[PDB]
Tab-separated table of C-alpha atoms and ligand atoms in Angstrom:
chain	number	residue	atom	x	y	z
A	1	UNK	CA	-30.802	25.816	-37.682
A	2	UNK	CA	-30.463	24.735	-34.071
A	3	UNK	CA	-33.780	23.572	-32.630
A	4	UNK	CA	-33.810	19.819	-33.277
A	5	UNK	CA	-30.421	18.931	-31.667
A	6	UNK	CA	-31.426	21.147	-28.748
A	7	UNK	CA	-34.691	19.213	-28.354
A	8	UNK	CA	-33.037	15.799	-28.557
A	9	UNK	CA	-30.250	16.902	-26.215
A	10	UNK	CA	-32.742	18.240	-23.680
A	11	UNK	CA	-34.742	15.015	-23.888
A	12	UNK	CA	-31.516	13.166	-23.125
A	13	UNK	CA	-30.831	15.652	-20.337
A	14	UNK	CA	-34.239	15.174	-18.751
A	15	UNK	CA	-34.411	11.407	-18.907
A	16	UNK	CA	-30.830	10.937	-17.760
A	17	UNK	CA	-30.976	13.092	-14.663
A	18	UNK	CA	-34.359	11.669	-13.623
A	19	UNK	CA	-32.709	9.131	-11.332
A	20	UNK	CA	-35.256	8.614	-8.548
A	21	UNK	CA	-33.122	5.974	-6.854
A	22	UNK	CA	-30.219	8.411	-6.607
A	23	UNK	CA	-31.088	10.037	-3.226
A	24	UNK	CA	-32.036	6.697	-1.685
A	25	UNK	CA	-28.854	4.874	-2.672
A	26	UNK	CA	-27.308	4.565	0.784
A	27	UNK	CA	-30.560	3.175	2.276
A	28	UNK	CA	-30.637	0.818	-0.694
A	29	UNK	CA	-27.189	-0.615	-0.052
A	30	UNK	CA	-27.186	-0.745	3.743
A	31	UNK	CA	-30.845	-1.784	3.812
A	32	UNK	CA	-32.275	-5.287	4.138
A	33	UNK	CA	-31.904	-5.984	0.415
A	34	UNK	CA	-28.116	-6.373	0.738
A	35	UNK	CA	-25.577	-7.740	3.216
A	36	UNK	CA	-23.244	-4.737	3.348
A	37	UNK	CA	-21.923	-3.160	6.516
A	38	UNK	CA	-21.730	0.616	6.630
A	39	UNK	CA	-18.013	0.420	7.375
A	40	UNK	CA	-17.379	-1.317	4.052
A	41	UNK	CA	-19.523	1.233	2.199
A	42	UNK	CA	-17.806	4.201	3.847
A	43	UNK	CA	-14.283	2.888	3.513
A	44	UNK	CA	-13.987	0.492	0.560
A	45	UNK	CA	-16.747	1.150	-1.978
A	46	UNK	CA	-17.395	4.847	-2.593
A	47	UNK	CA	-13.710	6.043	-2.905
A	48	UNK	CA	-13.427	3.950	-6.091
A	49	UNK	CA	-15.743	6.551	-7.679
A	50	UNK	CA	-13.223	9.329	-7.085
A	51	UNK	CA	-10.484	7.031	-8.351
A	52	UNK	CA	-12.482	6.175	-11.437
A	53	UNK	CA	-13.178	9.823	-12.080
A	54	UNK	CA	-9.504	10.716	-11.902
A	55	UNK	CA	-7.983	7.991	-14.098
A	56	UNK	CA	-10.834	8.287	-16.606
A	57	UNK	CA	-10.953	12.079	-16.822
A	58	UNK	CA	-8.030	12.977	-19.080
A	59	UNK	CA	-8.529	10.120	-21.624
A	60	UNK	CA	-12.258	10.844	-22.046
A	61	UNK	CA	-11.477	14.359	-23.328
A	62	UNK	CA	-9.145	12.686	-25.826
A	63	UNK	CA	-12.098	10.425	-26.672
A	64	UNK	CA	-14.341	13.494	-26.938
A	65	UNK	CA	-12.894	15.858	-29.517
A	66	UNK	CA	-11.697	12.996	-31.724
A	67	UNK	CA	-15.099	11.328	-32.006
A	68	UNK	CA	-16.686	14.833	-32.361
A	69	UNK	CA	-18.954	14.625	-29.327
A	70	UNK	CA	-21.565	12.091	-30.390
A	71	UNK	CA	-20.344	8.573	-29.377
A	72	UNK	CA	-19.094	9.654	-25.963
A	73	UNK	CA	-22.722	10.398	-25.064
A	74	UNK	CA	-23.593	6.921	-26.343
A	75	UNK	CA	-20.858	5.572	-24.064
A	76	UNK	CA	-22.475	7.519	-21.222
A	77	UNK	CA	-25.791	5.865	-22.064
A	78	UNK	CA	-24.240	2.398	-22.049
A	79	UNK	CA	-22.609	3.417	-18.752
A	80	UNK	CA	-26.013	4.413	-17.322
A	81	UNK	CA	-27.494	1.059	-18.352
A	82	UNK	CA	-24.551	-0.949	-16.971
A	83	UNK	CA	-24.436	1.010	-13.698
A	84	UNK	CA	-28.085	0.694	-12.812
A	85	UNK	CA	-28.359	-2.911	-14.016
A	86	UNK	CA	-25.496	-3.710	-11.678
A	87	UNK	CA	-27.284	-1.778	-8.958
A	88	UNK	CA	-30.318	-3.987	-9.532
A	89	UNK	CA	-28.768	-7.433	-9.647
A	90	UNK	CA	-25.181	-7.066	-8.437
A	91	UNK	CA	-24.157	-8.492	-5.077
A	92	UNK	CA	-20.927	-8.326	-3.109
A	93	UNK	CA	-18.204	-5.876	-2.134
A	94	UNK	CA	-16.486	-6.579	-5.463
A	95	UNK	CA	-19.316	-5.811	-7.864
A	96	UNK	CA	-20.275	-2.600	-6.108
A	97	UNK	CA	-16.801	-1.241	-6.784
A	98	UNK	CA	-17.466	-1.930	-10.481
A	99	UNK	CA	-20.680	0.059	-10.005
A	100	UNK	CA	-18.602	2.945	-8.680
A	101	UNK	CA	-16.181	2.635	-11.623
A	102	UNK	CA	-18.953	2.924	-14.188
A	103	UNK	CA	-20.516	5.781	-12.242
A	104	UNK	CA	-17.166	7.531	-12.461
A	105	UNK	CA	-17.281	7.089	-16.219
A	106	UNK	CA	-20.810	8.563	-16.154
A	107	UNK	CA	-19.534	11.632	-14.297
A	108	UNK	CA	-16.644	11.787	-16.772
A	109	UNK	CA	-18.821	11.880	-19.884
A	110	UNK	CA	-21.108	14.572	-18.427
A	111	UNK	CA	-18.512	17.163	-19.541
A	112	UNK	CA	-18.709	15.894	-23.116
A	113	UNK	CA	-22.501	16.117	-22.897
A	114	UNK	CA	-22.209	19.807	-22.041
A	115	UNK	CA	-19.496	20.377	-24.645
A	116	UNK	CA	-21.600	19.069	-27.561
A	117	UNK	CA	-23.696	22.275	-27.363
A	118	UNK	CA	-21.009	24.611	-28.697
A	119	UNK	CA	-20.156	22.063	-31.407
A	120	UNK	CA	-23.509	21.387	-33.048
A	121	UNK	CA	-25.235	24.766	-32.638
A	122	UNK	CA	-24.715	27.865	-34.781
A	123	UNK	CA	-22.859	30.494	-32.695
A	124	UNK	CA	-25.815	32.900	-32.450
A	125	UNK	CA	-27.344	30.566	-29.847
A	126	UNK	CA	-24.271	29.643	-27.797
A	127	UNK	CA	-25.823	31.495	-24.867
A	128	UNK	CA	-29.372	30.209	-25.284
A	129	UNK	CA	-28.913	26.480	-25.852
A	130	UNK	CA	-26.368	25.968	-23.053
A	131	UNK	CA	-28.547	27.683	-20.463
A	132	UNK	CA	-31.558	25.726	-21.719
A	133	UNK	CA	-29.775	22.370	-21.440
A	134	UNK	CA	-28.333	23.091	-17.997
A	135	UNK	CA	-31.749	24.226	-16.754
A	136	UNK	CA	-33.332	21.044	-18.132
A	137	UNK	CA	-30.792	18.876	-16.303
A	138	UNK	CA	-31.286	20.758	-13.018
A	139	UNK	CA	-35.079	20.551	-13.284
A	140	UNK	CA	-34.752	16.855	-14.102
A	141	UNK	CA	-32.748	16.114	-10.965
A	142	UNK	CA	-35.021	18.242	-8.748
A	143	UNK	CA	-38.210	16.678	-10.114
A	144	UNK	CA	-36.638	13.235	-9.899
A	145	UNK	CA	-35.927	13.613	-6.202
A	146	UNK	CA	-39.447	15.051	-5.690
A	147	UNK	CA	-41.138	12.112	-7.425
A	148	UNK	CA	-38.815	9.711	-5.607
A	149	UNK	CA	-39.653	10.850	-2.101
A	150	UNK	CA	-43.364	11.192	-2.853
A	151	UNK	CA	-43.593	7.659	-4.259
A	152	UNK	CA	-41.624	6.295	-1.295
A	153	UNK	CA	-43.526	8.069	1.461
A	154	UNK	CA	-46.986	7.677	-0.122
A	155	UNK	CA	-46.793	4.525	-2.221
A	156	UNK	CA	-45.292	1.749	0.016
A	157	UNK	CA	-42.565	1.520	-2.614
A	158	UNK	CA	-39.512	-0.614	-1.983
A	159	UNK	CA	-36.241	0.790	-3.225
A	160	UNK	CA	-35.590	-1.944	-5.805
A	161	UNK	CA	-38.538	-0.740	-7.857
A	162	UNK	CA	-37.148	2.789	-7.628
A	163	UNK	CA	-33.893	1.527	-9.137
A	164	UNK	CA	-36.059	-0.144	-11.809
A	165	UNK	CA	-37.576	3.276	-12.570
A	166	UNK	CA	-34.046	4.711	-12.730
A	167	UNK	CA	-32.954	1.963	-15.139
A	168	UNK	CA	-35.984	2.681	-17.311
A	169	UNK	CA	-35.293	6.416	-17.328
A	170	UNK	CA	-31.640	6.055	-18.269
A	171	UNK	CA	-32.637	3.436	-20.859
A	172	UNK	CA	-35.017	5.937	-22.462
A	173	UNK	CA	-32.078	8.356	-22.287
A	174	UNK	CA	-30.005	5.814	-24.213
A	175	UNK	CA	-32.746	5.617	-26.837
A	176	UNK	CA	-32.666	9.400	-27.317
A	177	UNK	CA	-28.868	9.536	-27.405
A	178	UNK	CA	-28.587	7.558	-30.641
A	179	UNK	CA	-30.782	10.011	-32.555
A	180	UNK	CA	-28.454	13.026	-32.468
A	181	UNK	CA	-26.647	14.519	-35.467
A	182	UNK	CA	-22.914	13.968	-35.708
A	183	UNK	CA	-21.631	17.571	-35.808
A	184	UNK	CA	-19.498	18.946	-38.586
A	185	UNK	CA	-16.456	20.113	-36.617
A	186	UNK	CA	-15.017	19.565	-33.164
A	187	UNK	CA	-13.409	22.250	-31.024
A	188	UNK	CA	-9.724	21.265	-30.876
A	189	UNK	CA	-8.776	18.327	-33.115
A	190	UNK	CA	-11.119	18.350	-36.113
A	191	UNK	CA	-11.224	22.086	-36.804
A	192	UNK	CA	-9.947	22.806	-40.307
A	193	UNK	CA	-7.877	26.065	-40.411
A	194	UNK	CA	-1.763	24.767	-28.586
A	195	UNK	CA	0.690	23.407	-26.047
A	196	UNK	CA	3.104	26.327	-26.401
A	197	UNK	CA	0.320	28.897	-25.960
A	198	UNK	CA	-0.899	27.140	-22.809
A	199	UNK	CA	1.600	29.004	-20.606
A	200	UNK	CA	-0.028	32.257	-21.744
A	201	UNK	CA	-3.404	30.986	-20.502
A	202	UNK	CA	-2.853	30.893	-16.728
A	203	UNK	CA	-0.533	33.920	-16.790
A	204	UNK	CA	-3.246	36.058	-15.207
A	205	UNK	CA	-3.749	37.079	-11.584
A	206	UNK	CA	-7.496	37.424	-12.192
A	207	UNK	CA	-7.678	33.828	-13.494
A	208	UNK	CA	-5.284	31.735	-11.376
A	209	UNK	CA	-6.557	32.204	-7.823
A	210	UNK	CA	-10.212	31.840	-8.828
A	211	UNK	CA	-9.345	28.652	-10.730
A	212	UNK	CA	-7.419	27.370	-7.709
A	213	UNK	CA	-10.398	28.021	-5.481
A	214	UNK	CA	-12.710	26.380	-8.035
A	215	UNK	CA	-10.488	23.302	-7.879
A	216	UNK	CA	-10.436	23.067	-4.079
A	217	UNK	CA	-14.154	23.855	-3.749
A	218	UNK	CA	-15.051	21.344	-6.469
A	219	UNK	CA	-13.021	18.646	-4.706
A	220	UNK	CA	-14.645	19.454	-1.380
A	221	UNK	CA	-18.144	19.503	-2.823
A	222	UNK	CA	-17.641	16.179	-4.588
A	223	UNK	CA	-16.452	14.647	-1.294
A	224	UNK	CA	-19.344	16.079	0.716
A	225	UNK	CA	-21.802	15.088	-2.015
A	226	UNK	CA	-20.451	11.548	-1.772
A	227	UNK	CA	-20.550	10.988	1.960
A	228	UNK	CA	-23.511	13.139	3.088
A	229	UNK	CA	-25.872	10.193	2.702
A	230	UNK	CA	-23.712	7.901	4.820
A	231	UNK	CA	-23.723	10.675	7.427
A	232	UNK	CA	-27.531	10.758	7.241
A	233	UNK	CA	-27.576	6.970	7.652
A	234	UNK	CA	-25.303	7.211	10.686
A	235	UNK	CA	-27.451	9.843	12.415
A	236	UNK	CA	-30.558	7.694	12.029
A	237	UNK	CA	-30.676	4.281	10.326
A	238	UNK	CA	-33.449	3.493	7.875
A	239	UNK	CA	-34.849	0.749	10.118
A	240	UNK	CA	-35.790	3.250	12.852
A	241	UNK	CA	-37.740	6.038	11.130
A	242	UNK	CA	-38.501	6.589	7.453
A	243	UNK	CA	-36.051	9.324	6.506
A	244	UNK	CA	-36.778	11.947	3.858
A	245	UNK	CA	-33.690	11.861	1.610
A	246	UNK	CA	-35.439	12.632	-1.663
A	247	UNK	CA	-37.339	15.665	-0.414
A	248	UNK	CA	-34.314	17.257	1.232
A	249	UNK	CA	-32.044	16.680	-1.752
A	250	UNK	CA	-34.863	18.020	-3.948
A	251	UNK	CA	-35.172	21.222	-1.913
A	252	UNK	CA	-31.369	21.487	-1.844
A	253	UNK	CA	-31.105	21.226	-5.629
A	254	UNK	CA	-33.981	23.701	-6.005
A	255	UNK	CA	-32.168	26.101	-3.707
A	256	UNK	CA	-29.040	25.575	-5.760
A	257	UNK	CA	-31.005	26.592	-8.836
A	258	UNK	CA	-32.368	29.647	-6.999
A	259	UNK	CA	-28.838	30.586	-5.927
A	260	UNK	CA	-27.504	30.193	-9.462
A	261	UNK	CA	-30.351	32.374	-10.713
A	262	UNK	CA	-29.533	34.893	-7.997
A	263	UNK	CA	-25.836	35.120	-8.908
A	264	UNK	CA	-26.454	36.609	-12.348
A	265	UNK	CA	-28.937	39.332	-11.335
A	266	UNK	CA	-27.178	41.313	-8.594
A	267	UNK	CA	-25.452	44.537	-9.653
A	268	UNK	CA	-22.837	45.426	-7.036
A	269	UNK	CA	-19.155	46.255	-7.582
A	270	UNK	CA	-17.681	42.769	-7.890
A	271	UNK	CA	-14.079	43.603	-7.006
A	272	UNK	CA	-15.037	45.409	-3.793
A	273	UNK	CA	-17.744	43.042	-2.528
A	274	UNK	CA	-15.962	39.880	-3.738
A	275	UNK	CA	-13.335	40.263	-1.007
A	276	UNK	CA	-16.262	39.988	1.455
A	277	UNK	CA	-19.000	38.075	-0.383
A	278	UNK	CA	-16.743	35.058	-0.802
A	279	UNK	CA	-15.676	35.270	2.841
A	280	UNK	CA	-19.065	35.407	4.569
A	281	UNK	CA	-20.603	32.543	2.615
A	282	UNK	CA	-17.396	30.530	3.005
A	283	UNK	CA	-17.871	30.956	6.767
A	284	UNK	CA	-21.472	29.822	6.147
A	285	UNK	CA	-20.185	26.671	4.397
A	286	UNK	CA	-17.794	25.881	7.247
A	287	UNK	CA	-20.522	26.410	9.829
A	288	UNK	CA	-22.898	24.192	7.877
A	289	UNK	CA	-20.490	21.272	7.745
A	290	UNK	CA	-19.665	21.722	11.439
A	291	UNK	CA	-23.416	21.785	12.094
A	292	UNK	CA	-23.853	18.471	10.317
A	293	UNK	CA	-20.994	16.964	12.302
A	294	UNK	CA	-21.906	18.057	15.837
A	295	UNK	CA	-25.663	17.501	15.732
A	296	UNK	CA	-27.865	14.584	16.652
A	297	UNK	CA	-31.286	15.652	15.323
A	298	UNK	CA	-31.694	14.543	11.753
A	299	UNK	CA	-33.495	17.662	10.547
A	300	UNK	CA	-30.546	19.711	11.778
A	301	UNK	CA	-28.228	17.678	9.560
A	302	UNK	CA	-30.693	18.031	6.680
A	303	UNK	CA	-30.724	21.786	7.216
A	304	UNK	CA	-26.947	21.723	7.246
A	305	UNK	CA	-26.957	20.047	3.850
A	306	UNK	CA	-29.541	22.531	2.541
A	307	UNK	CA	-27.527	25.565	3.641
A	308	UNK	CA	-24.288	23.979	2.422
A	309	UNK	CA	-25.516	23.081	-1.053
A	310	UNK	CA	-27.173	26.453	-1.630
A	311	UNK	CA	-24.080	28.271	-0.364
A	312	UNK	CA	-21.793	26.157	-2.537
A	313	UNK	CA	-23.841	26.731	-5.656
A	314	UNK	CA	-23.847	30.459	-4.883
A	315	UNK	CA	-20.094	30.752	-4.418
A	316	UNK	CA	-19.121	28.402	-7.225
A	317	UNK	CA	-21.435	30.176	-9.677
A	318	UNK	CA	-19.725	33.408	-8.605
A	319	UNK	CA	-16.403	31.698	-9.379
A	320	UNK	CA	-17.593	30.491	-12.805
A	321	UNK	CA	-18.741	34.037	-13.564
A	322	UNK	CA	-15.396	35.438	-12.425
A	323	UNK	CA	-13.514	33.104	-14.785
A	324	UNK	CA	-15.664	33.206	-17.921
A	325	UNK	CA	-15.614	36.945	-18.714
A	326	UNK	CA	-12.002	37.307	-19.844
A	327	UNK	CA	-11.415	34.358	-22.171
A	328	UNK	CA	-12.978	33.031	-25.374
A	329	UNK	CA	-15.104	29.900	-25.754
A	330	UNK	CA	-12.376	27.559	-27.023
A	331	UNK	CA	-9.972	28.457	-24.223
A	332	UNK	CA	-12.793	28.195	-21.663
A	333	UNK	CA	-13.187	24.442	-22.005
A	334	UNK	CA	-9.426	23.870	-21.927
A	335	UNK	CA	-9.108	25.962	-18.759
A	336	UNK	CA	-11.996	24.146	-17.085
A	337	UNK	CA	-10.579	20.801	-18.194
A	338	UNK	CA	-7.252	21.509	-16.511
A	339	UNK	CA	-9.116	22.877	-13.488
A	340	UNK	CA	-11.258	19.743	-13.258
A	341	UNK	CA	-8.153	17.547	-13.496
A	342	UNK	CA	-6.530	19.492	-10.656
A	343	UNK	CA	-9.737	19.199	-8.616
A	344	UNK	CA	-9.820	15.448	-9.042
A	345	UNK	CA	-6.138	15.090	-8.156
A	346	UNK	CA	-6.945	17.004	-4.963
A	347	UNK	CA	-10.024	14.884	-4.261
A	348	UNK	CA	-8.105	11.661	-4.908
A	349	UNK	CA	-5.343	12.717	-2.496
A	350	UNK	CA	-7.888	13.680	0.150
A	351	UNK	CA	-9.841	10.453	-0.358
A	352	UNK	CA	-6.729	8.281	-0.029
A	353	UNK	CA	-5.651	10.135	3.121
A	354	UNK	CA	-8.955	10.593	4.936
A	355	UNK	CA	-11.375	7.953	3.699
A	356	UNK	CA	-9.826	4.773	2.346
A	357	UNK	CA	-8.103	1.839	4.085
A	358	UNK	CA	-4.721	2.842	2.663
A	359	UNK	CA	-4.838	6.040	4.724
A	360	UNK	CA	-6.635	6.242	8.053
A	361	UNK	CA	-9.785	4.078	7.535
A	362	UNK	CA	-12.099	6.553	9.203
A	363	UNK	CA	-15.814	6.199	9.907
A	364	UNK	CA	-18.271	8.764	8.599
A	365	UNK	CA	-18.334	10.651	11.918
A	366	UNK	CA	-14.823	12.148	11.956
A	367	UNK	CA	-14.879	12.594	8.149
A	368	UNK	CA	-17.252	15.545	8.189
A	369	UNK	CA	-15.176	17.172	10.898
A	370	UNK	CA	-12.311	16.917	8.406
A	371	UNK	CA	-14.400	18.307	5.526
A	372	UNK	CA	-15.703	21.132	7.689
A	373	UNK	CA	-12.138	21.895	8.685
A	374	UNK	CA	-11.228	21.821	4.984
A	375	UNK	CA	-13.815	24.437	4.070
A	376	UNK	CA	-12.870	26.321	7.248
A	377	UNK	CA	-9.254	26.420	6.043
A	378	UNK	CA	-10.678	27.694	2.747
A	379	UNK	CA	-12.566	30.444	4.597
A	380	UNK	CA	-9.412	31.303	6.543
A	381	UNK	CA	-7.435	31.629	3.311
A	382	UNK	CA	-10.111	33.993	1.975
A	383	UNK	CA	-9.951	35.997	5.208
A	384	UNK	CA	-6.160	36.244	4.921
A	385	UNK	CA	-6.384	37.376	1.294
A	386	UNK	CA	-8.937	40.000	2.317
A	387	UNK	CA	-6.431	41.061	4.996
A	388	UNK	CA	-3.772	41.691	2.318
B	1	VIB	C1	-23.743	4.963	-8.278
B	1	VIB	C2	-23.383	6.097	-7.305
B	1	VIB	N1	-24.268	7.097	-7.078
B	1	VIB	C3	-23.962	8.071	-6.237
B	1	VIB	C4	-22.765	8.083	-5.602
B	1	VIB	C5	-22.631	9.319	-4.663
B	1	VIB	N2	-23.138	10.551	-5.305
B	1	VIB	C6	-22.430	11.252	-6.318
B	1	VIB	S1	-23.279	12.476	-6.716
B	1	VIB	C7	-24.491	12.374	-5.825
B	1	VIB	C8	-25.652	13.322	-5.800
B	1	VIB	C9	-25.680	14.121	-7.114
B	1	VIB	O1	-26.529	15.239	-6.968
B	1	VIB	C10	-24.331	11.198	-5.000
B	1	VIB	C11	-25.346	10.721	-3.948
B	1	VIB	C12	-21.880	7.078	-5.830
B	1	VIB	N3	-20.597	7.071	-5.157
B	1	VIB	N4	-22.191	6.100	-6.673
């Protein structure tokens, strides 16, 4: 059968991604509860996340197939508990970097969470259970941001209690994570009957350029998803007017879900339109990031994030569809693992150069000009490849 591990995995997926304090994190740190300047948050604290998601990406896969997918989720649950407990009680510029380290390990073990599906389930429901679990996680994050902003704007709720709610939700997620079945076989190591065949994998012109774009777009979206809240804080601090972070990130994630639903139900010639459909929405992404940089009204920057996140989820779902058709299931996770490693190398290089003190030590203003130029260079590369 398949239904019980699906139900426990979707319960873990709902109560993990219900993090109501997640949109309001940058008003929580720079707010009156802590003594943290926004220069130290922009330039010393958040880049550690990218660092911790590079150095702990490749070992976690090694600690995924060997433990056959169960205890890495339990490590993610312990990571949840440690991260939000340190968000509750932790003080200083030193402890908040440890927070970013453990949040990097959270983002690392998310891949093992998704990879448990093809390990425990009988192969008749490889399509059904994965789409179910991903939909449950997306609905969890959307409803979490909805409940967050409603409780804040209509409940006089300080942010510390919202982190308490987040701790409780990820703690309940840790209590569901223990009650999963250890699967019978893994996907690479513990299969009872690959380096030399790996050159044959990326020897495909329909699979290299799309993977390269997935890497650059994933790095850019992780950067923008990091620093968009510090940009929102810079445009209008939380002590002036009560900003609406949870509602806008909720509508943005809902639009991302609508875009991902809209990718798989449009029947046009993909090779002919794809030399244009990538280009126009890449221009949309570049214009959205430029719009968030140049503006001074806060709803204009919110609308820039809405248009950017919907356009990214559109184009990156198109990319995931244009990779997945050719290969099998076992090669799919290896290809996306190498692609994710390349994306985090690119994001680490760009975060050392642009963001951190070892590079330029930039404020959050000029940063989004650089990220908009990065996606504009991406759109120019697509325009040049259409011109070939
Ligand atoms: C503890 C912690 N939380 C969030 C971020 C930044 N961040 C990563 S993803 C995301 C939104 C996901 O939809 C945000 C705001 C961070 N650096 N550390």
